Write a protein that binds this ligand. Structure first.
Ligand SMILES: [Zn+2]
Length: 380
């Protein structure tokens, strides 16, 4: 027949750069380094196929439905009006179903979705086109309410666990280290660890979070809505904030990292925090655009990579992440980390995410799919 050599900047079948794929008809003949290919197929016509050739990326963290409650609980979300405004429509089943539709049109790559409304979980759990993990979000900073909140959450979880099918599993998501009491956090992590339920916790997203764990105050805590929290952060976390404390150290000493939960954002951490995460074997999900729009600072990917921590990519909800298309986060991340090997970004988008949410192979014999050529991606 007639082989075609499609070349790209980064290929992921470990990622390779430069990259290339020889296609014969609609079948992959070979995939690897391009020079190897031009030498193996001298008569093959070449085609510049764009920057990336790889399976559709996994959106390891997003919210297809949210609550005014979680917006109200986080002061820094309010400081960026556009985010609150954009987030208002992200309520209920209809909006969630439309989001899932978008994910499917984008390549049907896996997804790590945080769910708020029980009715949304009912609907998404029944989506035969989705794959990944649906994490039920739990939020309550009052120690005295921990037992009852846990019991209510467990009931829902036990019910849904029976509806769970291969490819789309149920997960749990304690909101943050400061909107969930220390008692409820441990009840949740222990339960999930024992039942084999994946976990995702938003940690150290904004710098003001690290500040209050150190001083008990600052722009976040001092500007919260009083009725939504106990009178002191100490009451929420069960210990006094201090100079040597951080939300990560808090979770580590609380014994929550023992369950190997996936930590989201993780922008404002210290070298010691990174060491604790690496030791525990926790994976982390970074949402580039979201962090930028929420003025949270920048995730230190090179530091996490050097520590050997598994990194995945997410877009976060569209309120702060713009779109549900992770291909766009890869582009953004390339700009954020000039010294970081682009191959690391692509591998993270695909393999990293798959490992977090639970990947098509691109090799000889496999059907060549246009979905592997990112430059041709359509969200409609
Ligand atoms: Zn989130």
């Amino acid at each position: 027949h007639t082989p075609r050599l499609l070349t790209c900047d980064v290929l992921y079948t470990g990622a390779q750069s430069p990259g290339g794929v020889v296609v014969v008809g609609e079948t992959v003949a070979a995939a690897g380094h391009p020079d190897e290919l031009r030498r193996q197929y001298p008569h093959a016509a070449e085609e510049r196929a764009g920057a990336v050739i790889a399976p559709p990326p996994v959106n390891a963290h997003t919210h297809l439905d949210m609550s005014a409650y979680e917006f109200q609980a986080l002061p820094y979300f309010q400081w960026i009006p556009e985010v609150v405004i954009r987030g208002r429509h992200l309520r209920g089943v209809a909006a969630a179903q439309a989001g899932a539709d978008t994910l499917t049109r984008l390549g049907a790559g896996g997804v790590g979705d945080i769910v708020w409304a029980p009715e949304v979980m009912d609907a998404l759990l029944a989506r035969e086109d989705l794959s990944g993990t649906l994490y039920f979000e739990v939020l309550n900073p009052f120690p005295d309410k921990a037992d009852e909140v846990f019991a209510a959450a467990r009931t829902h979880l036990e019910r849904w666990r029976r509806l769970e099918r291969p490819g789309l599993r149920l997960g749990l998501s304690p909101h943050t280290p400061f909107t969930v009491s220390h008692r409820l956090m441990r009840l949740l992590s222990d339960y999930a660890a024992g039942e084999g339920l994946p976990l995702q916790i938003h940690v150290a997203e904004h710098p003001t979070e690290l500040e209050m764990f150190r001083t008990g105050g600052g722009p976040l805590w001092d500007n919260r809505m009083p009725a939504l929290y106990p009178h002191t952060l100490a009451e929420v976390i069960g210990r006094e904030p201090g100079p040597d404390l951080t939300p990560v150290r808090y979770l580590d000493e609380l014994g929550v990292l023992a369950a190997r939960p996936t930590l989201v954002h993780m922008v404002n951490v210290t070298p010691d925090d990174i060491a604790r995460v690496a030791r525990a074997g926790c994976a982390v999900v970074t949402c580039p655009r979201s962090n930028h729009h929420l003025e949270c600072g920048t995730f230190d990917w090179p530091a996490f990579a050097a520590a050997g921590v598994e990194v995945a990519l997410g877009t976060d909800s569209v309120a702060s992440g713009e779109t549900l298309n992770v291909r766009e986060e890869v582009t953004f991340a390339r700009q954020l980390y000039p010294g970081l090997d682009p191959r690391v970004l692509v591998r993270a988008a695909v393999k990293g995410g798959q490992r977090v949410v639970g990947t098509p192979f691109l090799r000889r014999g496999e059907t060549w799919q246009e979905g592997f050529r990112w430059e041709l991606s359509r969200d409609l």
